From Swiss-Prot:
Source organism of the structure: Homo sapiens (Human)
The family this protein is said to belong to: Belongs to the BET family.
Protein name according to UniProt: Bromodomain-containing protein 4
Tissue specificity of this protein: Ubiquitously expressed.
Medical condition linked: Cornelia de Lange syndrome 6: A form of Cornelia de Lange syndrome, a clinically heterogeneous developmental disorder associated with malformations affecting multiple systems. It is characterized by facial dysmorphisms, abnormal hands and feet, growth delay, cognitive retardation, hirsutism, gastroesophageal dysfunction and cardiac, ophthalmologic and genitourinary anomalies. CDLS6 inheritance is autosomal dominant. A chromosomal aberration involving BRD4 is found in a rare, aggressive, and lethal carcinoma arising in midline organs of young people. Translocation t(15;19)(q14;p13) with NUTM1 which produces a BRD4-NUTM1 fusion protein.
Covalent link location (Glycyl lysine isopeptide (Lys-Gly) (interchain with G-Cter in SUMO2)): K57
Portion of the parent chain present: 43 to 166 of 1362
Length: 124
C-alpha cells in the first residue's frame, strides 16, 4: 500500500510571512514546477500504480513538490531551511531508489542544479 502523504497543514502551528518563504513559493517552486523534467516529482510516488512494491520499503522519508507547494502555501514552514530540506529529501530519495546515471537520476540532478541556482538568489 502507499503511505498517506506527508502532513501539509496544521492550524495549530504559528505562521509568518518572510521574504525567503515567499521567494521559495513564487520563484523556486514555480520555476521547478514548470520544468520539462518536473512531472515525476509533482506528486507523491504512487507505488501501487507503478507496480514498485519495494519503493516504501527503501524510501521511509517520502517527499515531492506537490507536498512542498502545499506546505509553503499553507504556511506550514516557519524556517526557509525546512523547505530547502524537503527539496533535498526529494532529490536524495530519487538518488537512493534509482542508480547512478539512470534517466530519472539525471532529471533529478538537472532539477537540483536549477534549484541551487535559484537558492543562490534567496533574498535577505
Ligand atoms: C508510468 C507513469 O509514470 C508517471 C506518470 C505521472 C504523470 C505525469 C503527468 N501528470 C499530469 C500526471 C501524472 C507522474 C509520475 C510517474 N512516474 C514516476 N513518478 C515518480 C518517479 C518515477 N516515476 N520513477 C521512475 C520509475 C518508474 C517505474 C519503474 C522504475 C522507475 C522513480 C521511481 C518511483 C522516481 O524516483 N520517481 C520520483
Amino acid at each position: 500500500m502507499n503511505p498517506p502523504p506527508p502532513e501539509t497543514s496544521n492550524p495549530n502551528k504559528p505562521k509568518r510571512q518572510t521574504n525567503q518563504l515567499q521567494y521559495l513559493l513564487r520563484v523556486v517552486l514555480k520555476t521547478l514546477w514548470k520544468h520539462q523534467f518536473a512531472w515525476p516529482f509533482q506528486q507523491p510516488v504512487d507505488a501501487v500504480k507503478l507496480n514498485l512494491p519495494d519503493y516504501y520499503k527503501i524510501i521511509k522519508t517520502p517527499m515531492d513538490m506537490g507536498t512542498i507547494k502545499k506546505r509553503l502555501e499553507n504556511n506550514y514552514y516557519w524556517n526557509a531551511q525546512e523547505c530547502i530540506q524537503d527539496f533535498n529529501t526529494m532529490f536524495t530519495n530519487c538518488y537512493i531508489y534509482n542508480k547512478p546515471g539512470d534517466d530519472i537520476v539525471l532529471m533529478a540532478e538537472a532539477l537540483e542544479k536549477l534549484f541551487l541556482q535559484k537558492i543562490n538568489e534567496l533574498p535577505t
